[PDB]
Scaffold this motif. Structure first.
Motif, PDB file in Angstrom:
ATOM      1  N   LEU A  70       3.946  -7.573  13.737  1.00 21.47           N
ATOM      2  CA  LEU A  70       2.598  -7.256  14.489  1.00 21.47           C
ATOM      3  C   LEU A  70       1.353  -8.058  14.278  1.00 21.47           C
ATOM      4  CD1 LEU A  70       1.024  -3.681  13.947  1.00 21.47           C
ATOM      5  CD2 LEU A  70       2.367  -5.122  12.371  1.00 21.47           C
ATOM      6  N   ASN A  91       1.937  -9.939  10.724  1.00 15.97           N
ATOM      7  CA  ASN A  91       2.310  -9.137   9.711  1.00 15.97           C
ATOM      8  C   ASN A  91       3.686  -8.535   9.832  1.00 15.97           C
ATOM      9  OD1 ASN A  91       2.428  -6.947   7.879  1.00 15.97           O
ATOM     10  ND2 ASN A  91       0.068  -6.196   8.276  1.00 15.97           N
ATOM     11  N   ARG A 110       4.599   4.529  14.931  1.00 17.76           N
ATOM     12  CA  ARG A 110       4.109   5.830  14.980  1.00 17.76           C
ATOM     13  C   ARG A 110       5.376   6.695  15.176  1.00 17.76           C
ATOM     14  NH1 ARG A 110       1.141   5.695  19.636  1.00 17.76           N
ATOM     15  NH2 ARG A 110      -0.675   5.116  18.909  1.00 17.76           N
ATOM     16  N   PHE A 143       4.363   7.626   2.031  1.00 15.47           N
ATOM     17  CA  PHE A 143       4.935   6.335   2.739  1.00 15.47           C
ATOM     18  C   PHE A 143       4.514   5.088   1.851  1.00 15.47           C
ATOM     19  CE2 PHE A 143       5.003   8.995   6.601  1.00 15.47           C
ATOM     20  CZ  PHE A 143       6.316   8.528   7.065  1.00 15.47           C
ATOM     21  N   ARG A 182      -4.461   1.204  10.171  1.00 17.64           N
ATOM     22  CA  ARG A 182      -4.487   0.756  11.344  1.00 17.64           C
ATOM     23  C   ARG A 182      -5.941  -0.014  11.494  1.00 17.64           C
ATOM     24  NH1 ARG A 182      -6.312   5.786  12.341  1.00 17.64           N
ATOM     25  NH2 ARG A 182      -4.447   6.792  13.312  1.00 17.64           N
ATOM     26  N   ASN A 210      -1.953  -8.411  12.846  1.00 15.96           N
ATOM     27  CA  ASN A 210      -2.889  -8.019  12.112  1.00 15.96           C
ATOM     28  C   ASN A 210      -4.249  -8.832  12.172  1.00 15.96           C
ATOM     29  OD1 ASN A 210      -1.213  -5.476  10.052  1.00 15.96           O
ATOM     30  ND2 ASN A 210      -2.306  -5.385  12.142  1.00 15.96           N
ATOM     31  N   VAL A 229       0.694  -1.139   0.003  1.00 19.32           N
ATOM     32  CA  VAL A 229       0.184   0.051   0.020  1.00 19.32           C
ATOM     33  C   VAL A 229       0.900   1.270  -0.142  1.00 19.32           C
ATOM     34  CG1 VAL A 229      -1.806  -1.269   1.240  1.00 19.32           C
ATOM     35  CG2 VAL A 229       0.098   0.235   2.672  1.00 19.32           C
TER      36      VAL A 229
HETATM   37  C1  LIG Z   1       2.255   3.017   4.370  1.00 20.73           C
HETATM   38  C2  LIG Z   1       1.940   2.240   5.657  1.00 20.73           C
HETATM   39  C3  LIG Z   1       1.439   1.002   5.680  1.00 20.73           C
HETATM   40  C4  LIG Z   1       0.840   0.612   6.619  1.00 20.73           C
HETATM   41  N1  LIG Z   1       0.563  -0.759   6.866  1.00 20.73           N
HETATM   42  C5  LIG Z   1      -0.051  -1.237   8.160  1.00 20.73           C
HETATM   43  C6  LIG Z   1      -0.624  -2.457   8.176  1.00 20.73           C
HETATM   44  O1  LIG Z   1      -0.527  -3.225   7.203  1.00 20.73           O
HETATM   45  N2  LIG Z   1      -0.816  -2.977   9.379  1.00 20.73           N
HETATM   46  C7  LIG Z   1      -0.746  -2.238  10.616  1.00 20.73           C
HETATM   47  O2  LIG Z   1      -1.080  -2.586  11.635  1.00 20.73           O
HETATM   48  N3  LIG Z   1      -0.282  -0.890  10.443  1.00 20.73           N
HETATM   49  C8  LIG Z   1       0.148  -0.473   9.238  1.00 20.73           C
HETATM   50  N4  LIG Z   1       0.517   0.817   9.244  1.00 20.73           N
HETATM   51  C9  LIG Z   1       0.538   1.772  10.554  1.00 20.73           C
HETATM   52  C10 LIG Z   1      -0.838   2.465  10.715  1.00 20.73           C
HETATM   53  O3  LIG Z   1      -1.334   2.886   9.728  1.00 20.73           O
HETATM   54  C11 LIG Z   1      -0.470   3.416  11.671  1.00 20.73           C
HETATM   55  O4  LIG Z   1       0.752   4.085  11.237  1.00 20.73           O
HETATM   56  C12 LIG Z   1      -0.008   2.767  13.208  1.00 20.73           C
HETATM   57  O5  LIG Z   1      -1.180   2.326  13.538  1.00 20.73           O
HETATM   58  C13 LIG Z   1       0.448   4.067  14.075  1.00 20.73           C
HETATM   59  O6  LIG Z   1      -0.515   5.134  13.954  1.00 20.73           O
HETATM   60  P1  LIG Z   1      -1.366   5.196  15.117  1.00 20.73           P
HETATM   61  O7  LIG Z   1      -0.977   5.040  16.264  1.00 20.73           O
HETATM   62  O8  LIG Z   1      -1.981   6.565  14.993  1.00 20.73           O
HETATM   63  O9  LIG Z   1      -2.763   4.324  14.912  1.00 20.73           O
HETATM   64  C14 LIG Z   1       1.042   1.326   7.963  1.00 20.73           C
HETATM   65  C15 LIG Z   1       1.413   2.726   7.752  1.00 20.73           C
HETATM   66  C16 LIG Z   1       1.687   3.284   6.757  1.00 20.73           C
HETATM   67  C17 LIG Z   1       2.407   4.692   6.639  1.00 20.73           C
END
Ligand SMILES: Cc1cc2nc3c(=O)[nH]c(=O)nc-3n(C[C@H](O)[C@H](O)[C@H](O)COP(=O)(O)O)c2cc1C
Ligand SMILES: Cc1cc2nc3c(=O)[nH]c(=O)nc-3n(C[C@H](O)[C@H](O)[C@H](O)COP(=O)(O)O)c2cc1C
Lengths: 109, 104
Positions: free
Chosen positions: B68, B80, B55, B97, B39, B70, B4
């Motif tokens: 982690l 994952n 984060r 990203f 997320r 998922n 993604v």
């Molecule tokens: C490009 C990209 C792909 C991501 N893919 C996943 C994923 O597949 N599984 C996951 O648990 N978090 C993934 N994340 C992380 C979450 O989108 C998010 O950054 C994470 O939960 C920390 O942010 P938050 O604490 O505000 O939720 C990804 C982040 C980015 C930038």
């Protein structure tokens, strides 16, 4: 790993996104490749029957997987195991194409 | 396979592109995930310390690789192996990203 995204809605379906692995694989900088068609990786030993096959999968707008000869920026000759996948929007409209690239010799199996 | 791309200029860093492999992996359709922050794959036994790590990498605008728990749409657990990569423009501004996911 290595992948790119192209924009078929633009002239000559240029690469509009390139991953770090793709840069490492081809020895090209992201500046050098954004705005260009991926065909630049092709050279002398590249099989045209294969290129036509790629030309055909793109016209039909269907996915595919091929193996063809490509060239790094420094002229290094490699088997590119190339996978294409079309992408349509919510109305069945072709928006992009995606490509995943592999060095065939590192992945003979 | 699975990847993604998100836009960190837009609010809540939403997913703006998804490969079929990620669709197959997560059991979601492209419709269900575009415009959403990645997320949503997280859940109850997901390590919150691993989440803070991600984060952190995002705020620092550097690449990381984490692992982690998922969840697929149907609620299926998987480990994952997540790799993230920040992407700047030619003048050095953060534009994207990208993320690659592995079923560990
Ligand atoms: C490009 C990209 C792909 C991501 N893919 C996943 C994923 O597949 N599984 C996951 O648990 N978090 C993934 N994340 C992380 C979450 O989108 C998010 O950054 C994470 O939960 C920390 O942010 P938050 O604490 O505000 O939720 C990804 C982040 C980015 C930038
Ligand atoms: C998403 C995508 C990725 C591509 N990646 C490569 C590549 O890595 N190497 C290559 O030789 N051709 C690649 N191609 C194919 C060329 O861009 C081009 O479509 C092909 O050479 C047929 O064009 P032509 O016959 O008009 O030259 C890719 C095409 C697409 C759509």
């Amino acid at each position: 790993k290595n992948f790119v995204i192209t924009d078929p809605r633009l002239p000559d379906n240029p690469i509009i996104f390139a991953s770090d692995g793709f840069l490492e694989l081809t020895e090209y900088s992201r500046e050098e490749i954004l705005g260009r068609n991926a065909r630049f990786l092709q050279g002398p030993e590249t099989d045209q029957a294969t290129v036509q096959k790629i030309r055909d999968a793109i016209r039909d707008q269907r996915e595919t997987t091929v193996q063809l000869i490509n060239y790094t920026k420094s002229g290094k000759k490699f088997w590119n195991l190339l996978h294409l996948q079309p992408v349509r929007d919510q109305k069945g409209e072709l928006q992009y194409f995606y490509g995943v690239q592999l060095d065939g010799s590192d992945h003979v199996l």
